[PDB]
Amino acid sequence: KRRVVVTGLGMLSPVGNTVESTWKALLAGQSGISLIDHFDTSAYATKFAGLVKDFNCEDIISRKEQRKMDAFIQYGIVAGVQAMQDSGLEITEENATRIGAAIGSGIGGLGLIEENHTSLMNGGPRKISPFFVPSTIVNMVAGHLTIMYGLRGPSISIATACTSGVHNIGHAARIIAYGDADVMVAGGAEKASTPLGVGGFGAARALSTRNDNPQAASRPWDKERDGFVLGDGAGMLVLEEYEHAKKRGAKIYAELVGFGMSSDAYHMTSPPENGAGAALAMANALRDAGIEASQIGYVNAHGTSTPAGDKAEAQAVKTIFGEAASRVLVSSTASMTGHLLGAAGAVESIYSILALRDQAVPPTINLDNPDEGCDLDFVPHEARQVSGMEYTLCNSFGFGGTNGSLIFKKI
Amino acid sequence: KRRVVVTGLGMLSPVGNTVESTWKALLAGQSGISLIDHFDTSAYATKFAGLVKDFNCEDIISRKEQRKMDAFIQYGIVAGVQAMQDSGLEITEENATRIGAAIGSGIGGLGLIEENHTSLMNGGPRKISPFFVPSTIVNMVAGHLTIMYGLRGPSISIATACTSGVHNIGHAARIIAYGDADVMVAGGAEKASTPLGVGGFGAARALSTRNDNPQAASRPWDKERDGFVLGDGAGMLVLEEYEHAKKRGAKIYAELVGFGMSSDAYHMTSPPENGAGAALAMANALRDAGIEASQIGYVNAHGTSTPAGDKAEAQAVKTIFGEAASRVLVSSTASMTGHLLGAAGAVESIYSILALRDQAVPPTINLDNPDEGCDLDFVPHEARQVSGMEYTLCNSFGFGGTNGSLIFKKI
Ligand SMILES: *C(=O)CCCCCCCCCCC
Ligand SMILES: *C(=O)CCCCCCCCCCC
């Protein structure tokens, strides 16, 4: 009966380009939302995003090599090395076969897609780069990594939009537990801060528009919210079976103990006023982890700062916790970071992990005037210290009404 | 100990728009490769593809609704209903919760992506449709279906390029086996026959160029092959736990018994001359299915008709079977259909399933002069009758050196 644990973290976010820095900034209640300058946003209703500041990979990827890879791919490779080094794991011939990857993304190479398409409009097919396909496709983060580290184990890539980070990790854990693998680098990476990304989500009227105050735009559960805030980043984890980890004295951040999935079966982009699906997903994980809602100390909300989004989730929480509704801590890091799409559930799994380590809980900044019936403790404004928190649960929900929840446990 | 079985099939291919018709054509050695007329291919090195002929969904999707969905999405919904009807399964409140989906695609809405991007180049962001995001994203086939059939169980979507069909199905099976679900509609859908698809794979020089004879272009293992042939389609399956199926007297096509994954850890688009990774993947499935290579009657090659591709796979086969190398039947349906990218491993799982039903094995057409050291029986030219075939194995391999194999078993 294989127990899956976390032995390495790696991350690039709108508030730090390392695990420890992003964590520091998050507790400090720092925002990473800035105005876009890599493209002309004049015609854009939204002109800011949670961006990755001063990203450098020269030490990890030759410029010769970068040309074959969209930023989302670069981001994820960098965050994977971070995780691989941190794990300490050493790949051997008697090894590779048993180490794999489960990394995804919501869209992938949107930028190079725009680039190549543009090229094709101006110059014709001859202009499309020969690396177009392998530079934009979603599974290339895992493709490059497995190659870089000579990994021969199971490699998959889940693309479930906003839920991708949660799924990739959950299924990484599954794969190991099944016996198909002993280690798995898992998570998600996105960099959709483009014309098509900004323009697209803005076409659906899903994005916030507070351009006069980018850092205040993302306000989960607050009364004046007006749609999520797009963020770039990548969050990777090294999951591994308990024994295999011990036998090598790996530093163990925590143990993955539960994984729940569900479908809303309602709208293609809208959550039921109910939160019915989100509930089922949390519910399924509690049962998988074989524990009770009363046991969760901190929930990492999907809480993207869309009017319906946030109401629905809160509903679900009540439903799931009921009594413990108020005793439980719910917070949205998206308040500082924005929503990282495919990377979202991965970075937030890392938050949930660190929150157990440090017995501290990142705040929901910008929460000035919460909604009405709210009975919940959204850790508004400032970080929170905790005593005996043994479990944290992390939620993510995406389009197609696809939800997933992960439960982390101390030591 | 949950046994997963197949209780419903659904498909749209370049040789039929139903399971039974595509199967008939395949045994008959019919090609589905035609010249492209939906876009101007003058500047294109390749001017043909395996296309879906006279596709109609009016009875399944309102035109009001089609506008919100890329063809790949339409294709997959249609193929899913096919599967759902065929299953006979009836969704109930005491049900939904236990029925989910695992459907993917390599790229998804490439067409609407091109459309919206074009729009944006000409008109600015205001031109991007409000359904851009949910119309192109990869997980929307499963999103729409779960919605249409009120499914609340686990829904995921694997995007592992050319391997997607195999993975989605394998992980569907896993999910059920785990207990997370009782039924799962799984498979893949693609429709990359576009400027960016044709142009892109042609930029990598990966595509065949025999425009004077489209139907002969795809020639797996033959001496004059020059790169795969792009095909559109969608292949869906209804996987379900054995007991749950019986208790409802569901018609059972076969039982999924093995699932193997692997990584090449070599090149990002190229297979080792070795076939080392493909071997490991087949190998892993035999062990998962708990059987021997000697037991496989028919292998459904990835066999895309690329020079290296086909050599590498054949190598792997030898490696895995060795003795049984020659006694085993290996064939590439891609010889008639072309390669269906994300849909590929799904349709071919259906082939592998029907081949057990009918004890018949689709041919590798166009195989005029095979390569040299070939000791293998590629069922060249015409279909083959078989006696006591209890297992068929189906391979698929994609970019990022991601491989996966599935083992099907009779009754
Ligand atoms: C979360 O579900 C929001 C939508 C996720 C879609 C993938 C990321 C957006 C790509 C944007 C245009 C292709
Ligand atoms: C198989 O691995 C071939 C590549 C799969 C990529 C997904 C389908 C191609 C989309 C083409 C341009 C985006």
Describe the structure.
Chains A, B: GO terms for molecular function: 3-oxoacyl-[acyl-carrier-protein] synthase activity; protein homodimerization activity. Chains A, B: It is an enzyme of class 2 (transferase). Chains A, B: One of its GO terms (biological process) is response to cold. Chains A, B: Keywords: Acyltransferase, Fatty acid biosynthesis, Fatty acid metabolism, Lipid biosynthesis, Lipid metabolism, Transferase. Chains A, B: This is 3-oxoacyl-[acyl-carrier-protein] synthase 2. Two copies of one chain form a homodimer. Chain A is an alpha/beta fold and 411 residues long. Chain A has two domains: 254 residues, Peroxisomal Thiolase, Chain A, domain 1; 153 residues, Peroxisomal Thiolase, Chain A, domain 1 (3-Layer(aba) Sandwich). Chain A is 34% helix and 19% strand. The first copy, chain A, has 14 helices and 14 strands. In chain A, the strands form three sheets. In chain A, strands 5-4-6-7-1-8-14-13-9-10 form a ten-stranded mixed sheet, with helices on both faces. Chain A has a two-stranded antiparallel sheet with strand order 2-3. In chain A, helix 3 packs across helix 6 and helix 7 packs across helix 14. The longest helix of chain A has 17 residues. The radius of gyration of chain A is 20 Å and the shape is globular. Chain A starts with a strand and ends with a strand. The relative contact order of chain A is 0.18. At the A-B interface, strand 4, helix 4, helix 5, helix 6 and strand 5 of A face strand 4, helix 4, helix 5, helix 6 and strand 5 of B. The structure holds lauric acid (2 copies). One lauric acid (DAO) sits at the interface of chains B and A.
